């Protein structure tokens, strides 16, 4: 799955978070997200979040730490360190 | 000297003095009134404002319907027409609201696994706290880290499945879900507020208590500020079924109180807020006040003949203890909002006792009503509800009717006649007998409170009337598309009902007040017919004429100083006039600038309407009067990239150089440049952060503003005339980073206050933070009631 | 509240008059006989003199040294008390303030600076020091009114500043000294808003 | 006449646990009604006065509390039982016997109790800068000697002027500095500094 394709892939990347915050946060289209907006006014705590790493890391397979969502506040941070972290 | 005479004379007059304060000090301890600032309410039926409810109560009608279709109940097999079969109800109606279903968990900070977690009554109470802070004037992002009281009184009940099984989806929020602590716990954690924040459970009669320590916490002073409020809501049928045991029901499901025909008490529910305040401190900062409270009792009916038998010597005893507490007299009420549960055992034992405790010393007949006829039992929600009630009937000058009374008791003596039921409207109208009133609540625990009120001072009178030529903006904002322009189609509503409101008293109200939110509209109409035509255009969708744009977590603005670029410049003579800030700023500057360079203020100031040498020194001192005249309307700045005469604008504003040096320095420099012709600042010459000082005389576009915008800072204003190099700015804004937006000051011409006014409301539009006190200040403006928050509401529920 | 905001002031040469005015607000003016009292720069408050209140007399007593040359008037009308000079001396530089007791001094007012003294606005010298052989400083030398600031490279320096008040010469001309110390080139400047000569001068050996 | 009132010179405090001020008297206070004539002012650091107990033992309305007035006709006292950091400045007896008052008084000091620490020297000789044409000036100075208390003479002395900071705010130690001055008489050839904290007396010339 990681063929490590030209930058489009982390489009890719930015369609798989908007869908892996939808299914943990209960909404049912995973389109209603705002992109600006930090995780903080969205209702994330020590529960939401934590299973959001380990569904995250078994679909890419990199470790990232539980400091990731005080590391990058909005999705549009996560997205782009999670691209730079590999390739 | 003195002997004998003055000596003992000042001493005597000094401890005088001190056992005066002293004295006064104990009276404000023991007995300091306390005002009620707004009201809140959620009333079975159509009832969502009190406007609604004191409507409903002049034209005397009810608000009995039937049964809930939404909630998933059997609704079958809740009444088998034997009584006693186990699961089987005996009302077959009731009051019941048609909104708890319903939520918005986005307006809040709230999940939408968490908020299907959320229990209605905690749900219900966020709105009220919300709708009752924003009815007050206060905006509710201005209360955080303050001490302000809050005081619940619920009944705890259960909403869902078991914490044993769990859910599927919905499992650590449960215990949260459904705890009478978090219900004010939640409150206090969503306005951010910090004083104390309690939950109360003591039967029907909670709501009253509830409000009695929030008037002992002002009182003490542990707080400056209290939300009183009680709440009662049902998500399952068990509580019909189960008091169906006791036969204590009637079966349609009304209050007849001080009937003949009295069969029960039927249930309800709602929800109920007010918003307390110490008299002498809502008078000191103008907040309105709407009644008085003086005196409250709490008291318990000890051994009785079983839990659910009532007494009549407490019921005395506390009536007795709340006069006392409120130093009046039984002859100084004119009115009593009973309870009138419509019991057939607990009717004549509280007619009695109001009759042994009011009526003996009587005059003139006192007269007695019940808002439960209108509404039925609310439970919890009760008694905050007949204060409501007391307060608009008192405010509007008419008592309401009682209905199920033509047919009065045959278990009651009415021979003295010292009591009149309320059968028809009366007139209370104002006069030198101040107006008073007592409200009863009593619990099936055992628990009995009563409270009197008192009209608010006749004082408000006395407003002058004073005209004037500057328009002011209006703004509107919400979190959300649809937000706006609901608020905006509600607004033109109001303004469409009511005729003869001044522009300037809406514009106050719009401004301090609501509070700041991302999605913003802004303008500034002549009249009020304009003002409709662009609010039904804001109402459609689109835009044009008003100024709107989205803008989170932004609160900064940059100061830039163009050069050269703003000539013939349009001479403004009313900005010098009209505005006085202009008229010291840079009346200072200009005789500072007199003796130095020849021409006067006089001469081309004066302006033929119809040379670097005169022009520089002239440019740099309307920039910096305009400069002032913007820090001092509220917007600070940032760090300036001020080119050419603005890197001398730059040095004036962060600290280089004084107003008259600076004006020197600049008349130097154009002095020796009209020859051969013929606080954060950030450099421009170079492009780094320096210190103000490091100007000096031997000191005298694009990657500036890539560092300035990654620094964080994403909007660019510039004082001048008219706008240059704004698209060589625009075109980098899609250019790099977030957009950039540039903000005229001044159009071809235009010297007309009301393009300031544009300006300013091009400020507001994306993310600038404007001090609308130091705007308005002196109008004579003063508050006026406005429409609430329009919701977006959708369907919560979780069967069980 | 019974404020009482005290007026006059300023400068006089030797040998002139003066008006202070106390104005009594808030309460009731009509037995409240006040005082004046006197703080010289430097040392404790001595009392000048008081006046008594129209029930009694309204007559006043003063205490030697300044009975002479001291009058005290008692417009009841306007609730105001007068303080009269007469040929004042360089010694008499002192802080004025107006009580409200004759015997029990109660609330006091705010007050005044007058200061008797004969000398031209002289701007200062500036006087940067020896250095410690670290203890590098710059005295100002004479200047006559008070108000002078003084700072290091333009106030970038914060620690070890220990500018003295001022002191008084036979001339009627003050200095200014303040020091830093910082182990091992800095410009110290001045400011006189009565002269307008600020100027800048650093001390390297 | 008068009583000579007295009181126990300065007294340094610290937060906290309390302390007190006495005030002895020569002649009996006790009026023959039965009441005593004291009364005790205050007057903070660059402010007006104010009155804190009258007639003996009674407290002005105002007052936040902690201050308490005890005694009987010869020996009265003025007591803190807390001790803040704002409540420093300069405390006055005060009687009525007499009327014509003429002057209040040296009056008590208080601060803020530290450790005791020794100062340091610096002599600047009268160099070949701005003295230039004929005048001298010359400053010794001093740094950090809590308590305060010192003096300063010169010899190969009667004309010197002298400056005192007020306690540097957070560290709490004063800084004084001196000046002696002369016109054309000088290079004839040291001040020298003596603290109760420190030894045996030092100096240095030139």
Redesign the interface.
Known sequence: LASLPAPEREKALFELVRSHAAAVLGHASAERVPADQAFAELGVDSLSALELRNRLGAATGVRLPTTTVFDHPDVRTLAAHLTSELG | ??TDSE?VAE?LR??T??LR??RQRIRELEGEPVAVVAMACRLPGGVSTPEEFWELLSEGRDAVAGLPTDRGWDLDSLFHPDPTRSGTAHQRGGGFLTEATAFDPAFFGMSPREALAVDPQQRLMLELSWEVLERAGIPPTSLQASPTGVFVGLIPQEYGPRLAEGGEGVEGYLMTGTTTSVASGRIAYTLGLEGPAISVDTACSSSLVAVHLACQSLRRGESSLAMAGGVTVMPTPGMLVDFSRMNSLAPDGRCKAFSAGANGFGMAEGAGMLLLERLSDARRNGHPVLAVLRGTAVNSDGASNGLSAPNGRAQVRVIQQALAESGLGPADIDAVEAHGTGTRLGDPIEARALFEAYGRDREQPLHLGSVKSNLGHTQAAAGVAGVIKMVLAMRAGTLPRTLHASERSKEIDWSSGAISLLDEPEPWPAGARPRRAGVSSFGISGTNAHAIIEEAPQVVEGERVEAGDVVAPWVLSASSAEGLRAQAARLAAHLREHPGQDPRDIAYSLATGRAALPHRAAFAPVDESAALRVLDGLATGNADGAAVGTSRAQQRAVFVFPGQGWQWAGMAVDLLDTSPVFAAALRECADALEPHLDFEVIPFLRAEAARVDVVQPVMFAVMVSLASMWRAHGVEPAAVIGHSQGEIAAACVAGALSLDDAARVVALRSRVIATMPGVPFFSTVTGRWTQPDELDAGYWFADAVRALAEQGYRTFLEVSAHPILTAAIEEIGDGSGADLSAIHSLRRGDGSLADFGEALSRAFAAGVAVDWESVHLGTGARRVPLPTYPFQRERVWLEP | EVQLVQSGGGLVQPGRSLRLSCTASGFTFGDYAMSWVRQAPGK????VGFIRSKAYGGTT?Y?ASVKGRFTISRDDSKSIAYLQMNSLKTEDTAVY?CTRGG????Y????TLVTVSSASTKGP??????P?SA?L?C?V?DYFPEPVTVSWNSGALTSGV?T????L?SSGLY?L?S?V?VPSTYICNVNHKPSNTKVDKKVEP | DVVMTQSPLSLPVTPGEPASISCRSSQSLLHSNGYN?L?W?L?KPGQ????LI??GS?R??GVPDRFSGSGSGTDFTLKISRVEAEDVGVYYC?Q?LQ?????????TKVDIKRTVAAPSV?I??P?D??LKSGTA?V?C?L?NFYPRGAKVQWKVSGNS?????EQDSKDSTY?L?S?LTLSKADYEKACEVTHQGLSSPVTKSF
């Open positions: 000297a003195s000596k001493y000094r401890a003095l001190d304060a002293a | 404790g408050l001595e009392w007593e205490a303030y015997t029990l001094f109660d006091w007012g705010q007050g010298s500036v006087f940067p020091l020896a410690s203890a400083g005295l030398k220990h003295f008040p001022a002191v010469q200095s000294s020091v110390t | 004539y009364d002012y007057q007006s006065p104010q009155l009258y007639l009674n002005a309305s005060m009525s009327t014509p008052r003429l002057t209040f008084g040296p009056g610096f600047f000789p160099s800068e701005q000036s400053v100075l740094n002027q002298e400056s005192v900071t800084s500095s000046t």
